[PDB]
Structure formats: C-alpha cells, structure tokens
Amino acid sequence: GSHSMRYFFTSVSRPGRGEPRFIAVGYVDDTQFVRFDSDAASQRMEPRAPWIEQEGPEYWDGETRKVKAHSQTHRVDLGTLRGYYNQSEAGSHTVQRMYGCDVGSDWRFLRGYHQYAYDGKDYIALKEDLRSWTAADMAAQTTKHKWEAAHVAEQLRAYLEGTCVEWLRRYLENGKETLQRTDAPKTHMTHHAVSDHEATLRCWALSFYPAEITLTWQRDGEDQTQDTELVETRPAGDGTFQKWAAVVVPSGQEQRYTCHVQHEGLPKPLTLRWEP
Amino acid sequence: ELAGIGILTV
C-alpha cells in the first residue's frame, strides 16, 4: 500500500520565561520515529522507534544540527511575524511547519508537501505543483516574494521528490518488521440495558495498524451514512489503534443489527453480530 | 531525513 514520511514543527514564544518551546516530530505512516524538544536535557534528535537506532552517529549528528537550525529559523520568524501583523511583544504566538512525502504501493513519488501556519492559521503553503506558493494574506506575500527570489520551491522540489522518498524507501526497508506489517483488529461486542426496553450494543476494534479503518452498523443496506455516532479513532499507546461504535435499540429483538469492520489487515471484511 | 535545503526565514 501507500506510505509517507512527514515532519511536524511547533514553536511557541513564551515572552517572559525565555526562548520559545520547540518540538519536532517525525513520522513514517502512523509511526513516530524521531523527536526533538528544546526543553529536554538531551539537546539531541532522539529515536522513538527501534529501526532508526540502527543509523550511525553521523546521521544523528546531522539530524541534530538540522533540527536546531530549524528551531532558530522559527525564532527569527516569530520576531518577524509580530512585525508583519503589527502585534506587541506581550502575547504568546505559535509557528508551525509541516512537510513530507507520499509514495504509492510501488514506492514511487505521488506528492509532496510543505506548509507553514501562524497562530493556528495558514500563512504560506507550497502548492501541489511544487512550484507555486499559496499566500494566505498580505504579510504572507512579503514572504512569498522573498522565497521566490531565493528559489525555495526549487530546493523543496529537490528534497520532496528525491531525498524524502529515497529515505522513506530506506526506512521502509530497514524497519520492514514494523512499518510494512499489518495488525488486524481484534474485536468483541458488549451489551447491557440502560432501562426496561432499552439497550446499547457496542462494537469494538482494538490493536489494529495502520489507523485507517471503517466501523459501521447495518440492519440491512445502509444506503447513506447512518446516524450511529462513532468515536474518533484513538491511539492505544503501544503503537496500535482502537475505535468503537455504539447503537441503542429495542431490548427484545437484537439480531436486527450487525457490526461491520473493514481494515487492510483483513482480506475479507468482518461481519460481527451477537445477542448477549 | 530532515530537509537540509529550502528552509528559510519568513
């Protein structure tokens, strides 16, 4: 299937305490593999997955330098943006950046991304063509003109389409046991009345990987998205994911409903149905 | 692998 590599950066200015808090995190698909936190004693890019610890000290040193360079650029940006938005030195402000790769089932480049946000809103993004910039407002125009004069897109074009995929391929190979696996969801179903003539049947999907999964009920053919309020997919904490859907119905009959689960780890889509 | 180029101040 498809895969991706993404880097997320957040810098928050704390005027009064000290330098901004900076936190960087890297992911391959739904797996975090590295992190950096400006407030940690470490002051190094650290691994968060076994397969990345195989990279030598040269790699780590390089990643550490780059990530710190990212941090200091965000520091300069925070000071520039106040100016642009004519804001004071008092409040706390946030700068976020994200970029990465998408490859298909053949591991070839599908698309790249490089986006930047200020105080939670889009500030400037690189378009799908990897050559044009989408500047949200007037301040962002100043930035797009300076990034155009320096050919930032062309540089990102080289990184997103070449380096990012080359390393995405490398990581998928080195961490094949983890990244190319597929954990099928373990499922079960509970049931207990809330009052006479009322009972909530609840379906579960646990320990599954990747995170992409569909959990829907059916009396028969849905036809449209049913009113069943499904909880947002969440991380188990051990690298897997979980998600449950629940329905209230007439106590008596309970064979009217059937929970359906669809995941990449399952060849045939599951169809659970039991009346406790 | 972090980007080692194309990263500039706004």
Epitope: G62, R75, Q155, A158, W167 | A3, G4, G6, I7
Partner: T-cell receptor, first 109, second 116 residues
Framework: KQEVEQNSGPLSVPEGAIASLNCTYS??????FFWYRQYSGKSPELIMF????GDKEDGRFTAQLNKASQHVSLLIRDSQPSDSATYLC?????????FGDGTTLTVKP | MSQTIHQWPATLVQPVGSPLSLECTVE??????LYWYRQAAGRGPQLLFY??????ISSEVPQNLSASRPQDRQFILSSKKLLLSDSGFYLC?????????????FGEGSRLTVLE
C-alpha cells in the same frame, strides 16, 4: 579526511584544455554540494553550489552531481594559467559544510 | 549589491602560552549562521564552531579554543593560552539563516603561527 575524497594532484593540464576535477563523498544524507577555489596564501572562494542531479554550468565552470555513486565533478573549460590553484569540494552534511582536502591544479602556459 | 564578510587580524605570530582574539564581521544580512573553520597546510578547512543566530549549534569541542557572538553580525574566536598545535589558517564563514543556498562565503582568513 574520508568523508570527502579528492585526488591531491598536482594535476597538470595544458593551457586551453578542459580540466576535470573529481570528488567522492561518503555521507548518504548530503543534500547540497559546493566547489571552492583557493589560491596559495588565500582563503577559498566560492565557485558554485548545486543541489540537484546532473550538470550546472556557470561560465567556464561546470559542476556535475551523481547521487547514486556519490560523485561530484568540476570541469573547467579553456583552462588558463590563472586558474592554477587548489580546488576544494565540500558537501553539506547538515547545517554546515564538510571539506575534502582538495586537488591542486597546475595549468602550463 | 553588498553582502560582505571580513576578518582580523590577517596574520599573527605569537608565543606559546599567549592569548588569542580573532574577529569576524558580516554586512548585508541579518541573523546569519556563522562558522569558524581552521585549515592546516595540504588540508581542507576543518569546522570548529557553527553558530546560529541565537547560539552554538555544533556540539564540536576544540581543545583550547572558544567562540562568542557579542552581536548579530560580530563573531569572535578566543583562547586564554595558545598551544603550538594552534598554528593554522583560521577562516570565518556565513550562510543565510535557516538551511539554504544563500551565502556560504569565507572571510580572508587569519594566519596564526604559534612559536616555541
């Protein structure tokens, strides 16, 4: 050192000929590359940089990048005695430049 | 039209045990990355210090040297007591803030000869 390898020379090239300088790097994650020219007693001066495969020409100078073999070249067209110097290859291995020891070029008039 | 970098002094001859103070100044950019390299004869420049606009980035540790940046565009290399080993050609360089292609140029260098 061994992160960036260049023959040391002196490499002789007749005046008017093309001088070709080669460089091999070992750091897989290198994303940009540079060439400097350094005359005896002087600091190095930037010739070019490149961050993409293929050739990049600037006047008489042409830089070539082949990431597959981690090879970087520099061709100097119409060599003159004035380009006698030590040419340094540098790789950007993360926020900084790491240098080869250079190849000394001598162009005979 | 005018991005510049200069270092001083150009040449120094000092005895073992004396202090060192090399200066590097830049002009035409703000918040640049500043670097101190040292070059030995027959060799490529070797990195000593890599400072971003707000502090040192390299974890590198030269034996008898220290760097400081008392101003955005002013960079200093010091030593309280020089070692013979400290003879070399000290080079300062700069690159635009962040990680890009702007800059990457050296000052004229400071030749240091420490004598026994």
């Amino acid at each position: 050192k061994q992160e960036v390898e260049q023959n040391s020379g002196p490499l002789s090239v007749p005046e008017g000929a093309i001088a070709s300088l080669n460089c091999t790097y070992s750091f897989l994650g290198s994303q940009s590359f540079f060439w400097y020219r350094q005359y005896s007693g002087k600091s190095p001066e930037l010739i070019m940089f490149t961050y993409r495969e293929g050739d990049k020409e600037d006047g008489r100078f042409t830089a070539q990048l082949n990431k597959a073999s981690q090879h970087v070249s520099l061709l100097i067209r119409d060599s003159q005695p004035s380009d006698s110097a030590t040419y340094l290859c540098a790789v950007n291995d993360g926020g900084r430049l790491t240098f080869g020891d250079g190849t000394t070029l001598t162009v005979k008039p | 039209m005018s991005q510049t970098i200069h270092q001083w002094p150009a040449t120094l001859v000092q005895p073992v045990g004396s202090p060192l103070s090399l200066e590097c100044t830049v002009e035409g950019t703000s918040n640049p990355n500043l670097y101190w390299y040292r070059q030995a004869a027959g060799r490529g420049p070797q990195l000593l210090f890599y400072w971003g606009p707000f502090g040192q980035i390299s974890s590198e540790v030269p034996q008898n040297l220290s760097a400081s940046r008392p101003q955005d565009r002013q960079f200093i290399l010091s030593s309280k007591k020089l070692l013979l080993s400290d003879s070399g050609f000290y080079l300062c360089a700069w690159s635009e803030t962040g990680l890009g292609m702007g800059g990457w140029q050296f000052g004229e260098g400071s030749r240091l000869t420490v004598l026994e």
